[PDB]
From a paper:
Here we structurally and biochemically characterise the DLP pair from [name]. The respective proteins, here called Cj-DLP1 (84.5 kDa) and Cj-DLP2 (71.2 kDa), were cloned, expressed and purified. Both DLPs are monomeric in solution and form a stable heterotypic tetramer, termed Cj-DLP1/2tetramer, with 2:2 stoichiometry when mixed. The tetramer is dominated by a 2-fold symmetry where Cj-DLP2 with its symmetry mate (termed Cj-DLP2α and Cj-DLP2β) form a central back-to-back cis dimer flanked on each side by Cj-DLP1 (termed Cj-DLP1α and Cj-DLP1β). Combined with GTPase activity and lipid binding, we present a mechanism for how the tetramer tethers and bridges distantly opposing membranes.
Numbering used by the authors:
A (entry chain A): 1 to 141, 144 to 147
B (entry chain C): 305 to 356
C (entry chain C): 408 to 526, 534 to 611
D (entry chain D): 408 to 509
Amino acid sequence: MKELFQKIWQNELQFLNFDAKFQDKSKLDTAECAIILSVNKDNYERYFLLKEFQELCKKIDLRVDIFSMQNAQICILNLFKSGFISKQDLLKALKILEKISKNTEIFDFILQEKVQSIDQKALFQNDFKELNTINLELQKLDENL
Amino acid sequence: FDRLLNQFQSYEKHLLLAYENFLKEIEILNHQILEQLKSISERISSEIFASV
Amino acid sequence: KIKNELYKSFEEIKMKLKDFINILEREILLFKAEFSNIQKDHIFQSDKNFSELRAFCNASDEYFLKDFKELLFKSILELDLFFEKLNLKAFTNYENATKLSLAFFSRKINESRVLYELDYPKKSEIYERVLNELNVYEFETLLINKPILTKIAKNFLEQSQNLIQEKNKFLDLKKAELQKRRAQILNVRESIKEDHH
Amino acid sequence: KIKNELYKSFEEIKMKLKDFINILEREILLFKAEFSNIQKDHIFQSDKNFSELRAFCNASDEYFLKDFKELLFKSILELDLFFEKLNLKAFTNYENATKLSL
């Protein structure tokens, strides 16, 4: 997807490592991810000067610098691939946002990309029985608790 | 600035690690070159004997 | 085939050195990309400070990378010249060595014959003579006594360590400047906090 | 004596190439030194514009100089290899040539 990032950041593209540097994996919801993806090199100055975008990035723990924007886009796309957080609803949100940002390339890439294994209910059962085990351990070590 | 310095130190540490294998490989190659030379010379000294 | 094998080995060594430099380069360029654009968050954060930091990190290739590249190029040059020497004195001149040693033994044989007073080649002698013609004393010295490849590798390692040290000193200058600012700020804070006097 | 003369000539050629690169380098570094520090004159002038110019001109080594140096190094490598070839097949193997033809 280096070709994609060259497409959307033609000359202001920076030297960056294509993997999800993400620290929390729940750092931002899908609409906020779509907003971050729509920071194409043609809208980027306006977005950075916009107070509401600055508030959003302070909520997410981002800067308004170009490099960190592109790095966050990378991480979002890798989570879209691997951890498979986004549905076609991400594509919905980008179509919604196209009021402002005519971001066709990222939209097409999200559309035509082998998605991943989904594996939801197994993960649910694993996490829930993790929590059950933690509850049991707490019960081991007071009667009211 | 501390990050940059730490990166430099990490690079130095990695180099120091890798040179352990690297120098011994180079030594091996030295020995290999010499033995290839000696094998060539043995073949030629065999065939000079034919030639008698 | 032997010559091709040795050429491949030489290539391997050069490739390893190149990989080292590439590792360092990747890290440094990531640093440059991050910090050429860092922008102050909220007013009172000294716009000029951030601008100068951005410029410095932009120039960081020149600052931290190019000397390593030059060192790598020098080492590669020396390696290539050594392979050239090994090729042209041994792995091409074997025909010449054969002709010279063979003719020498021929002349020795005829000298033996010219003793018509009734009062000839050993294999060990032939081996030693062919070894001498192939310059294998010189290449023994350059391969084992004073190993050339090993010397090159140590040159690379020692000079890269020197470069790292120089870079560290250079960065210590920047940290000292920052410390000046910090000390000024702390002086103001302690002045405010000790006005209960 | 002949071999030393040829070695000196080879050195001369390499030196000329180096001088060319040094000329270019001198000009490029003067540009960098001048324009890494240009500061706005007037109230209404774009501080950010000037800052970005300063950073770019500071990066001008990477931008304009290093490729030329790499090219110069390539050329020097090839020249040295050619001199080594001429040395080791002719200006040292004259003894061997004499013995063989004789």
